[PDB]
Amino acid sequence: VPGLCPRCKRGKHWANECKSKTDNQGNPIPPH
Ligand SMILES: [Zn+2]
């Protein structure tokens, strides 16, 4: 029962299953 992805901050999933729509890299999340 993992939530707010421990890699980004715009999803509630896990790294392997993570894809943050912020930039063209991996986790360009501006808040974190
Ligand atoms: Zn994520």
Q: Ligand 1 center to residue 10 CA distance, Å?
A: 6
Q: Ligand 1 center to residue 27 CA distance, Å?
A: 7
Looking at residue 17, the DSSP 8-state letter turns out to be T
Answer whether 14's CB lies under 8 Å from 8's CB: no
Q: Which two tokens stand for residue 21?
A: 């729509």
Q: Ligand 1 center to residue 18 CA distance, Å?
A: 4
Q: Ligand 1 center to residue 32 CA distance, Å?
A: 11
* Helices and strands in the chain, H and E counts: 0, 0
**Would you kindly state where each structural domain of the chain is located, as residue ranges?**
1-32
Q: Provide the b/e sequence for 1-20 (b: ≥16 CB within 10 Å).
A: eeeebebbebbeeeeeeeeb
Which technique was the structure solved with, according to the deposited record?
Answer: NMR
Q: Ligand 1 center to residue 16 CA distance, Å?
A: 9
CB neighbour list of residue 15: distance below 8 Å, 6 or more residues apart: 5, 6, 7
CB neighbour list of residue 5: distance below 8 Å, 6 or more residues apart: 11, 12, 13, 14, 15, 18, 20
Q: Which two tokens stand for residue 18?
A: 């993570």
Q: Which two tokens stand for residue 12?
A: 């509630």
- The CB-side HSE value for 16 (13 A sphere, CA atoms) comes to 1
